[PDB]
Amino acid sequence: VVTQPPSVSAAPGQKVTISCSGSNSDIGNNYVSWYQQLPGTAPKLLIYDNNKRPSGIPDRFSGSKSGTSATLAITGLQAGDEADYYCGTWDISLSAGLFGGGTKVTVLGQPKAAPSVTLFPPSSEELQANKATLVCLISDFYPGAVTVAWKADSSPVKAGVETTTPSKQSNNKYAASSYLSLTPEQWKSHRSYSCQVTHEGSTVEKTVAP
Amino acid sequence: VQLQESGAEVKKPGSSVRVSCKASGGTFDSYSIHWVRQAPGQGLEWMGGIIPAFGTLSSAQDFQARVTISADKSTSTAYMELSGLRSEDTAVYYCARGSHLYPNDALAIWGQGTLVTVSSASTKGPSVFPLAPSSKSTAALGCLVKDYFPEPVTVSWNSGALTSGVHTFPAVLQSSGLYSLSSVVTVPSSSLGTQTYICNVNHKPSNTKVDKRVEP
Ligand SMILES: CCCSc1nc(N[C@@H]2C[C@H]2c2ccc(F)c(F)c2)c2nnn([C@@H]3C[C@H](OCCO)[C@@H](O)[C@H]3O)c2n1
């Protein structure tokens, strides 16, 4: 089994290294390739034939291979390098491809950013279909951890709430979403709804009145 | 230089899936094609490979009596068939084209991957609703994609003409066992009076596409 550390961390601009450890049957007698898997995307080839970069791959990525070990080095670490990295190899005696377990790269000390909150009330189409869903969108925040609480007028509401785990936007900040499903007696009675977002101990709350 | 794969579908335990992988350039040339899977939130796992130009193939020992790999030259499509599906076979099935012209080969061109869900629960297409822009929401607008099964749903805007400012959220799995997601886009406020906004929702597991107009 080809092994890698489960995680590695550094601050922006710093050098990070990831080693792949195998046997004489795989890495020892073959070549190692490295794959980048950004969140919610397909893997991408970073390095092949131990140390070759495909065209378009940043030169901050480099590879080396010694005996049964291989190393991927990432210089000038950027937030956009946060991903899972896998080494890949071929073991000719088994005629099979092998992957390391993957190493999660975290870029520590990125700048903090409070969330913005956008709240959509139910659409006339959904209301006509006898259903009612409020959609709260949380965006542009860092670190990627929030708690979302809802109120109908001043009453806390737990039932009918669903929230996504934050994931990155194209600008490297995080976004999340939360949903409040309502009963016809909630929609006929409440005058307002509120989506309360807690991030790093401070709260951002948006209210909508149908 | 692109490998095309679908969404794609729902399987009961014990059934089989055929995952398709089509080369864009109309050839595999003398390159290899490999199948790699990934269970949600887990690592990559090699399943099998073929060099279509030669017909030479190999499959992972762990899948030898369950996996068949083949290549269709006429439509430059490779196929992998996994039989006796188990709960643990729920995964994204990627196809990747090799780097070596037929041995320092690597997986150089990757497909988007097809999610195969193994479950006894029935398929359900989504209900799509607009998230209309207003003074209360540059302006944010979107689409709510409600109560579908299994995953995934993909969302594009204006048939791919709108990519800037688009954020499609992961789905939420509700108590009912159905998923929901939203796709939102931030646009210049002035564009609200000069162009139309249509979200194109694809739910390949139910073979459904919905084009939903989003009006202010
Ligand atoms: C018979 C299987 C043909 S596919 C194949 N692929 C080779 N390299 C794979 C892509 C690279 C790879 C790297 C990293 C990974 F993580 C991964 F999953 C895959 C490959 N390397 N050697 N061979 C030989 C060729 C020979 O075919 C016989 C022709 O008469 C057979 O002995 C293979 O072991 C590869 N075949």
CSV table of C-alpha atoms and ligand atoms in Angstrom, one decimal:
chain,number,residue,atom,x,y,z
A,1,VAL,CA,0.0,0.0,0.0
A,2,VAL,CA,1.4,3.4,-1.0
A,3,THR,CA,1.2,5.9,1.9
A,4,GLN,CA,1.1,9.6,2.4
A,5,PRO,CA,0.5,11.8,5.4
A,6,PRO,CA,-3.3,12.6,5.7
A,7,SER,CA,-2.5,16.4,6.1
A,8,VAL,CA,0.1,19.2,5.7
A,9,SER,CA,0.0,22.9,6.6
A,10,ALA,CA,1.8,26.2,6.0
A,11,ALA,CA,1.0,29.9,5.8
A,12,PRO,CA,0.8,31.8,2.4
A,13,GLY,CA,4.0,32.1,0.4
A,14,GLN,CA,5.6,29.2,2.4
A,15,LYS,CA,7.0,25.9,1.1
A,16,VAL,CA,5.2,22.7,1.6
A,17,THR,CA,6.3,19.1,0.8
A,18,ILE,CA,4.3,15.8,0.4
A,19,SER,CA,6.0,12.4,0.3
A,20,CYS,CA,4.6,9.2,-1.1
A,21,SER,CA,6.1,5.9,0.4
A,22,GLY,CA,5.7,2.6,-1.5
A,23,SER,CA,7.5,-0.7,-2.3
A,24,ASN,CA,10.1,-2.1,-4.7
A,25,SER,CA,7.2,-3.6,-6.6
A,26,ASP,CA,5.6,-0.2,-7.4
A,27,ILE,CA,7.4,3.2,-6.8
A,28,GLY,CA,10.8,1.4,-6.5
A,29,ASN,CA,10.7,0.0,-10.0
A,30,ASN,CA,8.2,2.5,-11.7
A,31,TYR,CA,7.5,6.2,-12.1
A,32,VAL,CA,5.4,8.5,-9.9
A,33,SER,CA,2.7,11.0,-11.0
A,34,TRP,CA,0.9,13.5,-8.8
A,35,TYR,CA,-2.7,14.7,-8.9
A,36,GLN,CA,-4.4,17.8,-7.5
A,37,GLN,CA,-8.1,17.6,-6.5
A,38,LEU,CA,-9.5,21.0,-5.7
A,39,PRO,CA,-12.8,20.8,-3.7
A,40,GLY,CA,-15.8,19.6,-5.8
A,41,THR,CA,-13.7,19.0,-8.9
A,42,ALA,CA,-12.1,16.1,-10.9
A,43,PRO,CA,-8.4,15.3,-10.2
A,44,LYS,CA,-5.8,17.1,-12.4
A,45,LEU,CA,-2.3,15.9,-13.3
A,46,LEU,CA,0.4,18.0,-11.7
A,47,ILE,CA,3.6,15.9,-12.2
A,48,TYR,CA,4.3,12.9,-14.3
A,49,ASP,CA,7.4,10.7,-15.0
A,50,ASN,CA,8.6,11.7,-11.5
A,51,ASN,CA,9.4,15.4,-12.2
A,52,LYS,CA,7.8,16.6,-15.4
A,53,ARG,CA,5.1,19.2,-15.4
A,54,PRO,CA,2.3,19.2,-18.1
A,55,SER,CA,2.0,22.6,-19.9
A,56,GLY,CA,-0.1,25.1,-17.9
A,57,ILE,CA,0.8,23.6,-14.5
A,58,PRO,CA,2.5,26.3,-12.2
A,59,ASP,CA,6.3,25.9,-11.9
A,60,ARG,CA,5.7,26.2,-8.0
A,61,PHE,CA,5.0,22.4,-8.3
A,62,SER,CA,8.0,20.1,-8.5
A,63,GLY,CA,8.6,16.4,-8.1
A,64,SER,CA,11.4,14.0,-7.2
A,65,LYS,CA,11.8,10.2,-6.7
A,66,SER,CA,14.3,8.2,-4.6
A,67,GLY,CA,14.1,4.4,-4.3
A,68,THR,CA,10.7,3.5,-2.9
A,69,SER,CA,9.8,7.2,-2.1
A,70,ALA,CA,8.6,10.2,-4.0
A,71,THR,CA,8.0,13.9,-3.1
A,72,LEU,CA,5.8,16.7,-4.4
A,73,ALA,CA,7.1,20.2,-3.4
A,74,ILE,CA,4.8,23.3,-3.5
A,75,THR,CA,6.7,26.6,-3.2
A,76,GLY,CA,4.9,30.0,-2.6
A,77,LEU,CA,1.8,28.3,-1.3
A,78,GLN,CA,-1.5,30.2,-2.2
A,79,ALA,CA,-5.0,29.8,-0.8
A,80,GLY,CA,-5.9,28.4,-4.2
A,81,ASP,CA,-3.5,25.4,-3.5
A,82,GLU,CA,-5.9,24.2,-0.7
A,83,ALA,CA,-6.8,20.7,-2.0
A,84,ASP,CA,-6.2,17.0,-1.8
A,85,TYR,CA,-3.0,15.7,-3.4
A,86,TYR,CA,-2.5,12.1,-4.5
A,87,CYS,CA,0.6,10.3,-5.8
A,88,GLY,CA,0.0,7.6,-8.4
A,89,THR,CA,2.1,4.7,-9.7
A,90,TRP,CA,1.9,1.5,-11.7
A,91,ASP,CA,3.0,-1.9,-10.4
A,92,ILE,CA,4.0,-3.9,-13.6
A,93,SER,CA,4.0,-7.3,-11.7
A,94,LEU,CA,0.3,-6.8,-10.9
A,95,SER,CA,-0.4,-4.7,-14.1
A,96,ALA,CA,-2.4,-2.3,-11.8
A,97,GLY,CA,-2.5,1.4,-10.9
A,98,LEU,CA,-2.0,2.4,-7.3
A,99,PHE,CA,-2.8,5.6,-5.4
A,100,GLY,CA,-1.5,7.0,-2.1
A,101,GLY,CA,-4.2,7.8,0.5
A,102,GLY,CA,-4.2,11.5,-0.3
A,103,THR,CA,-2.8,14.5,1.6
A,104,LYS,CA,-5.0,17.5,2.4
A,105,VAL,CA,-3.2,20.8,2.1
A,106,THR,CA,-4.5,23.6,4.4
A,107,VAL,CA,-3.2,27.2,4.0
A,108,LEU,CA,-3.1,28.6,7.6
A,109,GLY,CA,-3.4,32.3,8.6
A,110,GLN,CA,-5.5,33.5,5.7
A,111,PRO,CA,-7.2,37.0,6.3
A,112,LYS,CA,-10.5,36.9,8.2
A,113,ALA,CA,-13.7,38.1,6.5
A,114,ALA,CA,-17.2,38.6,8.0
A,115,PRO,CA,-20.1,37.1,6.1
A,116,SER,CA,-22.7,38.9,4.0
A,117,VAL,CA,-26.2,37.5,4.2
A,118,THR,CA,-28.9,37.5,1.4
A,119,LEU,CA,-32.4,36.2,2.2
A,120,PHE,CA,-34.9,35.2,-0.5
A,121,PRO,CA,-38.6,34.7,0.5
A,122,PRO,CA,-40.7,31.9,-1.2
A,123,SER,CA,-41.4,32.4,-4.9
A,124,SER,CA,-45.0,33.0,-6.1
A,125,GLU,CA,-44.6,29.7,-8.1
A,126,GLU,CA,-43.7,27.6,-5.1
A,127,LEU,CA,-46.5,29.3,-3.0
A,128,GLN,CA,-49.0,28.4,-5.8
A,129,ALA,CA,-47.7,24.7,-5.5
A,130,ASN,CA,-48.7,25.0,-1.7
A,131,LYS,CA,-45.1,25.0,-0.4
A,132,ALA,CA,-42.9,27.7,1.1
A,133,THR,CA,-39.1,27.8,1.3
A,134,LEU,CA,-36.9,30.7,2.4
A,135,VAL,CA,-33.3,30.6,1.1
A,136,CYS,CA,-30.5,32.2,3.0
A,137,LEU,CA,-27.2,32.7,1.2
A,138,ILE,CA,-24.1,33.3,3.3
A,139,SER,CA,-21.1,34.6,1.3
A,140,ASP,CA,-17.6,36.0,1.3
A,141,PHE,CA,-16.5,34.7,4.7
A,142,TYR,CA,-13.2,33.3,6.1
A,143,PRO,CA,-12.6,31.0,8.0
A,144,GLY,CA,-15.1,28.6,6.5
A,145,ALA,CA,-17.2,27.9,9.6
A,146,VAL,CA,-20.6,29.4,10.5
A,147,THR,CA,-23.7,28.6,12.6
A,148,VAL,CA,-27.1,29.5,11.1
A,149,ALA,CA,-30.2,30.0,13.2
A,150,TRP,CA,-33.7,31.1,12.0
A,151,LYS,CA,-36.5,33.0,13.6
A,152,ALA,CA,-40.2,33.5,12.4
A,153,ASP,CA,-41.1,36.8,13.9
A,154,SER,CA,-39.3,36.5,17.3
A,155,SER,CA,-39.8,32.7,17.6
A,156,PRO,CA,-36.8,30.5,17.1
A,157,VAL,CA,-37.5,27.8,14.5
A,158,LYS,CA,-35.5,24.5,14.5
A,159,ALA,CA,-37.8,22.2,12.4
A,160,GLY,CA,-37.7,22.5,8.7
A,161,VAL,CA,-34.1,23.9,8.7
A,162,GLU,CA,-31.3,22.5,6.5
A,163,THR,CA,-27.9,24.0,6.1
A,164,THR,CA,-24.9,23.2,3.8
A,165,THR,CA,-21.3,22.9,5.0
A,166,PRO,CA,-19.4,25.9,3.7
A,167,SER,CA,-17.4,25.5,0.5
A,168,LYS,CA,-15.1,27.9,-1.5
A,169,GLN,CA,-16.2,30.6,-4.0
A,170,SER,CA,-14.0,31.3,-7.0
A,171,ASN,CA,-12.4,34.2,-4.9
A,172,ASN,CA,-11.2,31.7,-2.2
A,173,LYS,CA,-13.7,33.0,0.4
A,174,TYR,CA,-16.5,30.7,1.6
A,175,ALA,CA,-20.2,30.6,1.0
A,176,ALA,CA,-23.0,28.5,2.6
A,177,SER,CA,-26.7,28.1,2.2
A,178,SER,CA,-29.6,27.5,4.5
A,179,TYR,CA,-33.3,26.6,3.9
A,180,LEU,CA,-36.4,27.1,6.0
A,181,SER,CA,-39.4,25.1,4.9
A,182,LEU,CA,-42.7,26.4,6.3
A,183,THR,CA,-46.2,25.1,7.1
A,184,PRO,CA,-49.2,26.9,5.6
A,185,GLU,CA,-50.1,28.0,9.2
A,186,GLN,CA,-46.5,29.5,9.6
A,187,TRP,CA,-46.8,31.4,6.2
A,188,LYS,CA,-50.3,32.7,7.1
A,189,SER,CA,-49.3,34.0,10.5
A,190,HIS,CA,-45.7,35.3,10.6
A,191,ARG,CA,-44.9,38.9,9.5
A,192,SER,CA,-41.1,38.4,9.2
A,193,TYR,CA,-38.4,35.8,9.1
A,194,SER,CA,-34.7,36.1,10.0
A,195,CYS,CA,-31.5,34.2,9.1
A,196,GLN,CA,-28.9,34.7,11.9
A,197,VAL,CA,-25.3,33.8,11.0
A,198,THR,CA,-22.6,33.5,13.7
A,199,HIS,CA,-19.0,33.7,12.5
A,200,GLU,CA,-16.0,33.8,14.8
A,201,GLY,CA,-18.3,34.8,17.7
A,202,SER,CA,-20.0,37.8,16.0
A,203,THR,CA,-23.5,37.6,14.4
A,204,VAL,CA,-24.9,39.0,11.0
A,205,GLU,CA,-28.7,38.8,10.8
A,206,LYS,CA,-30.9,39.5,7.7
A,207,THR,CA,-34.7,39.8,8.0
A,208,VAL,CA,-37.4,39.6,5.2
A,209,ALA,CA,-41.0,40.5,5.5
A,210,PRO,CA,-43.2,38.9,2.7
B,1,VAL,CA,-8.2,17.1,-25.5
B,2,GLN,CA,-11.4,16.5,-23.4
B,3,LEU,CA,-13.0,13.3,-22.0
B,4,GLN,CA,-16.8,13.5,-21.8
B,5,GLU,CA,-18.9,11.7,-19.2
B,6,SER,CA,-22.5,12.1,-17.9
B,7,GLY,CA,-24.0,12.9,-14.4
B,8,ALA,CA,-25.4,10.1,-14.2
B,9,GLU,CA,-27.8,7.4,-12.5
B,10,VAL,CA,-29.6,5.0,-9.7
B,11,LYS,CA,-28.9,1.3,-9.1
B,12,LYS,CA,-30.4,-1.3,-6.8
B,13,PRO,CA,-27.9,-3.6,-4.9
B,14,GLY,CA,-26.9,-6.5,-7.1
B,15,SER,CA,-27.5,-4.7,-10.5
B,16,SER,CA,-24.7,-3.5,-13.0
B,17,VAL,CA,-23.6,-0.1,-14.4
B,18,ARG,CA,-22.0,0.7,-17.7
B,19,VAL,CA,-20.1,4.0,-17.4
B,20,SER,CA,-19.3,5.8,-20.7
B,21,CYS,CA,-16.2,8.0,-21.5
B,22,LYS,CA,-16.0,9.8,-24.9
B,23,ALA,CA,-12.8,11.4,-26.4
B,24,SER,CA,-13.5,14.8,-27.9
B,25,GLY,CA,-10.8,14.7,-30.7
B,26,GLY,CA,-12.4,11.6,-32.3
B,27,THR,CA,-9.4,9.3,-31.3
B,28,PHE,CA,-7.7,7.6,-28.4
B,29,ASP,CA,-4.6,7.5,-30.7
B,30,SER,CA,-2.1,5.1,-29.0
B,31,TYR,CA,-2.9,6.4,-25.5
B,32,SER,CA,-4.4,4.5,-22.6
B,33,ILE,CA,-7.8,5.0,-20.9
B,34,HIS,CA,-8.2,4.3,-17.2
B,35,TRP,CA,-11.1,4.1,-14.8
B,36,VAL,CA,-10.7,5.6,-11.4
B,37,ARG,CA,-13.4,5.7,-8.7
B,38,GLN,CA,-13.9,7.8,-5.6
B,39,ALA,CA,-16.5,7.1,-2.9
B,40,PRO,CA,-17.9,10.4,-1.5
B,41,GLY,CA,-15.2,12.1,0.7
B,42,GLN,CA,-12.8,9.2,0.3
B,43,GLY,CA,-9.6,8.5,-1.8
B,44,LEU,CA,-9.0,7.6,-5.4
B,45,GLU,CA,-9.1,3.9,-6.5
B,46,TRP,CA,-7.9,2.5,-9.8
B,47,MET,CA,-10.4,0.0,-11.4
B,48,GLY,CA,-9.0,-0.8,-14.8
B,49,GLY,CA,-7.4,0.4,-18.0
B,50,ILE,CA,-7.2,-0.3,-21.7
B,51,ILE,CA,-4.9,0.8,-24.7
B,52,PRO,CA,-7.7,0.9,-27.4
B,53,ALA,CA,-5.2,1.0,-30.3
B,54,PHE,CA,-4.0,-2.5,-29.1
B,55,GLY,CA,-7.0,-3.9,-27.2
B,56,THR,CA,-4.7,-4.7,-24.3
B,57,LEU,CA,-6.5,-4.3,-20.9
B,58,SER,CA,-6.2,-4.9,-17.2
B,59,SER,CA,-8.5,-4.6,-14.2
B,60,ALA,CA,-7.9,-4.3,-10.4
B,61,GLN,CA,-7.6,-7.7,-8.7
B,62,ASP,CA,-10.2,-6.4,-6.1
B,63,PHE,CA,-12.7,-6.2,-9.1
B,64,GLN,CA,-11.6,-8.9,-11.6
B,65,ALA,CA,-14.8,-11.0,-11.4
B,66,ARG,CA,-17.0,-7.8,-11.3
B,67,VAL,CA,-15.3,-5.4,-13.8
B,68,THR,CA,-15.2,-5.5,-17.7
B,69,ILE,CA,-13.4,-2.7,-19.7
B,70,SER,CA,-13.9,-2.2,-23.4
B,71,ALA,CA,-13.4,0.5,-26.1
B,72,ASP,CA,-15.7,1.5,-29.1
B,73,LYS,CA,-13.4,3.0,-31.8
B,74,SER,CA,-16.5,4.1,-33.9
B,75,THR,CA,-17.5,6.7,-31.3
B,76,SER,CA,-14.1,7.0,-29.5
B,77,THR,CA,-15.9,5.9,-26.3
B,78,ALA,CA,-14.4,3.7,-23.6
B,79,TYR,CA,-16.8,1.7,-21.3
B,80,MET,CA,-16.4,0.1,-17.9
B,81,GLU,CA,-19.1,-2.3,-16.6
B,82,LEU,CA,-19.2,-3.0,-12.8
B,83,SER,CA,-21.5,-5.9,-11.8
B,84,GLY,CA,-23.0,-7.0,-8.5
B,85,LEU,CA,-23.3,-3.4,-7.2
B,86,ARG,CA,-23.0,-3.0,-3.4
B,87,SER,CA,-23.8,0.0,-1.1
B,88,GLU,CA,-20.0,0.6,-1.1
B,89,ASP,CA,-20.0,1.0,-4.9
B,90,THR,CA,-21.7,4.5,-4.5
B,91,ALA,CA,-19.0,6.7,-6.0
B,92,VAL,CA,-17.9,9.1,-8.7
B,93,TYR,CA,-16.5,7.0,-11.7
B,94,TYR,CA,-13.8,9.0,-13.5
B,95,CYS,CA,-12.3,8.2,-16.8
B,96,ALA,CA,-8.8,9.5,-17.6
B,97,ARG,CA,-6.7,9.4,-20.8
B,98,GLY,CA,-3.0,8.5,-20.5
B,99,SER,CA,0.1,10.6,-21.3
B,100,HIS,CA,2.3,8.0,-23.0
B,101,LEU,CA,2.0,7.1,-26.8
B,102,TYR,CA,2.4,3.3,-26.8
B,103,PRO,CA,6.5,3.0,-19.7
B,104,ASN,CA,6.2,6.3,-17.8
B,105,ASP,CA,2.4,6.7,-18.5
B,106,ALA,CA,0.2,8.9,-16.3
B,107,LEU,CA,-3.5,10.0,-16.2
B,108,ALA,CA,-3.3,13.3,-18.1
B,109,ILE,CA,-6.9,14.1,-19.3
B,110,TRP,CA,-9.7,13.6,-16.8
B,111,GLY,CA,-13.4,13.3,-17.3
B,112,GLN,CA,-15.8,15.2,-15.0
B,113,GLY,CA,-16.9,11.8,-13.5
B,114,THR,CA,-20.2,10.0,-13.2
B,115,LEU,CA,-21.9,9.6,-9.8
B,116,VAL,CA,-23.3,6.1,-9.4
B,117,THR,CA,-25.6,5.8,-6.4
B,118,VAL,CA,-26.4,2.2,-5.1
B,119,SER,CA,-29.8,2.3,-3.3
B,120,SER,CA,-33.2,0.6,-3.3
B,121,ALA,CA,-35.0,4.1,-3.1
B,122,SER,CA,-36.8,5.3,-6.3
B,123,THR,CA,-35.7,8.2,-8.7
B,124,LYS,CA,-37.4,11.6,-8.4
B,125,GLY,CA,-36.9,14.6,-10.7
B,126,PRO,CA,-36.5,18.1,-9.2
B,127,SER,CA,-39.0,20.9,-8.9
B,128,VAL,CA,-37.3,24.1,-10.0
B,129,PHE,CA,-38.3,27.6,-8.6
B,130,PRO,CA,-36.8,31.1,-9.4
B,131,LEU,CA,-35.0,33.2,-6.7
B,132,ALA,CA,-36.1,36.5,-8.2
B,133,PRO,CA,-33.8,39.5,-7.9
B,134,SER,CA,-35.3,42.7,-6.1
B,135,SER,CA,-34.2,45.8,-4.2
B,136,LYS,CA,-33.8,43.3,-1.2
B,137,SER,CA,-31.2,41.2,-3.1
B,138,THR,CA,-24.9,44.4,-8.3
B,139,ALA,CA,-28.0,42.1,-7.7
B,140,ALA,CA,-28.2,38.5,-6.6
B,141,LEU,CA,-30.7,36.1,-8.4
B,142,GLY,CA,-30.9,32.3,-8.6
B,143,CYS,CA,-32.8,29.0,-8.8
B,144,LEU,CA,-34.0,26.7,-6.1
B,145,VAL,CA,-33.8,23.0,-7.2
B,146,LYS,CA,-36.0,21.1,-4.8
B,147,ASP,CA,-36.6,17.5,-3.7
B,148,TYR,CA,-34.8,15.2,-6.2
B,149,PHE,CA,-33.1,11.8,-5.9
B,150,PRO,CA,-30.4,10.6,-6.3
B,151,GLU,CA,-27.7,13.2,-6.7
B,152,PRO,CA,-26.3,15.0,-8.8
B,153,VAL,CA,-28.0,18.1,-10.3
B,154,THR,CA,-25.9,20.5,-12.5
B,155,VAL,CA,-26.9,24.0,-13.1
B,156,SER,CA,-25.8,26.3,-15.9
B,157,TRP,CA,-27.0,29.9,-16.7
B,158,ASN,CA,-28.2,31.1,-20.2
B,159,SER,CA,-27.0,27.8,-21.8
B,160,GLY,CA,-23.4,28.5,-20.6
B,161,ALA,CA,-23.3,32.2,-21.7
B,162,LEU,CA,-23.2,33.3,-18.0
B,163,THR,CA,-20.3,31.9,-15.9
B,164,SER,CA,-19.0,35.0,-14.1
B,165,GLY,CA,-20.4,35.4,-10.5
B,166,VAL,CA,-22.2,31.9,-10.6
B,167,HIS,CA,-22.0,29.9,-7.4
B,168,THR,CA,-23.8,26.5,-7.3
B,169,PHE,CA,-24.1,25.2,-3.7
B,170,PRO,CA,-23.7,21.6,-2.7
B,171,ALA,CA,-27.0,19.9,-2.1
B,172,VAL,CA,-28.6,19.4,1.3
B,173,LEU,CA,-30.0,16.0,2.2
B,174,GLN,CA,-33.4,16.5,3.9
B,175,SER,CA,-35.2,14.2,6.5
B,176,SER,CA,-37.5,12.9,3.6
B,177,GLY,CA,-34.4,11.4,1.9
B,178,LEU,CA,-34.6,13.9,-1.0
B,179,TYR,CA,-32.0,16.5,-2.0
B,180,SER,CA,-32.2,20.2,-2.6
B,181,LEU,CA,-29.8,22.8,-3.9
B,182,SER,CA,-29.6,26.4,-5.1
B,183,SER,CA,-27.6,28.1,-7.8
B,184,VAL,CA,-27.0,31.8,-7.5
B,185,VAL,CA,-25.5,34.5,-9.7
B,186,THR,CA,-24.4,38.1,-8.9
B,187,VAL,CA,-25.0,40.4,-11.9
B,188,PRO,CA,-24.8,44.2,-12.7
B,189,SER,CA,-28.1,45.6,-11.4
B,190,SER,CA,-28.6,47.4,-14.9
B,191,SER,CA,-28.4,44.0,-16.7
B,192,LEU,CA,-31.8,43.1,-15.0
B,193,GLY,CA,-33.6,45.4,-17.5
B,194,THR,CA,-31.4,44.5,-20.6
B,195,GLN,CA,-31.3,40.7,-20.6
B,196,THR,CA,-33.1,37.5,-19.6
B,197,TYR,CA,-31.8,35.0,-17.0
B,198,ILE,CA,-32.6,31.3,-17.4
B,199,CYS,CA,-31.2,28.6,-15.2
B,200,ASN,CA,-30.7,25.3,-17.0
B,201,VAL,CA,-31.0,22.4,-14.5
B,202,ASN,CA,-29.9,18.9,-15.5
B,203,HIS,CA,-30.9,15.8,-13.5
B,204,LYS,CA,-29.3,13.0,-15.5
B,205,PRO,CA,-30.5,10.2,-13.1
B,206,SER,CA,-34.1,11.0,-14.0
B,207,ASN,CA,-33.2,12.1,-17.6
B,208,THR,CA,-34.8,15.5,-16.9
B,209,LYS,CA,-33.7,19.0,-17.9
B,210,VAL,CA,-35.6,22.1,-16.7
B,211,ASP,CA,-35.0,25.6,-18.2
B,212,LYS,CA,-36.4,28.0,-15.7
B,213,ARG,CA,-36.9,31.7,-16.4
B,214,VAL,CA,-35.8,34.0,-13.5
B,215,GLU,CA,-37.6,37.4,-13.7
B,216,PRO,CA,-37.3,40.5,-11.4
C,1,LIG,C1,-2.9,-3.7,-20.0
C,1,LIG,C2,-3.3,-2.4,-19.3
C,1,LIG,C3,-3.0,-1.3,-20.3
C,1,LIG,S1,-3.2,0.3,-19.5
C,1,LIG,C4,-1.5,0.5,-18.9
C,1,LIG,N1,-1.3,1.7,-18.3
C,1,LIG,C5,-0.1,2.0,-17.7
C,1,LIG,N2,0.2,3.1,-17.0
C,1,LIG,C6,-0.9,3.7,-16.3
C,1,LIG,C7,-1.5,5.0,-16.7
C,1,LIG,C8,-0.6,5.0,-15.5
C,1,LIG,C9,-1.1,5.2,-14.1
C,1,LIG,C10,-0.3,6.0,-13.3
C,1,LIG,C11,-0.7,6.3,-12.0
C,1,LIG,C12,-1.9,5.8,-11.5
C,1,LIG,F1,-2.3,6.1,-10.3
C,1,LIG,C13,-2.7,5.1,-12.4
C,1,LIG,F2,-3.8,4.6,-11.9
C,1,LIG,C14,-2.3,4.8,-13.7
C,1,LIG,C15,0.9,1.0,-18.0
C,1,LIG,N3,2.3,1.0,-17.6
C,1,LIG,N4,2.8,-0.2,-18.1
C,1,LIG,N5,1.8,-0.8,-18.7
C,1,LIG,C16,2.1,-2.1,-19.2
C,1,LIG,C17,2.0,-2.3,-20.7
C,1,LIG,C18,1.7,-3.8,-20.9
C,1,LIG,O1,0.7,-3.9,-21.9
C,1,LIG,C19,1.0,-5.1,-22.7
C,1,LIG,C20,1.0,-4.7,-24.2
C,1,LIG,O2,1.3,-5.9,-24.9
C,1,LIG,C21,1.3,-4.4,-19.6
C,1,LIG,O3,2.4,-5.2,-19.1
C,1,LIG,C22,1.2,-3.2,-18.6
C,1,LIG,O4,1.6,-3.5,-17.3
C,1,LIG,C23,0.6,-0.1,-18.7
C,1,LIG,N6,-0.6,-0.4,-19.2
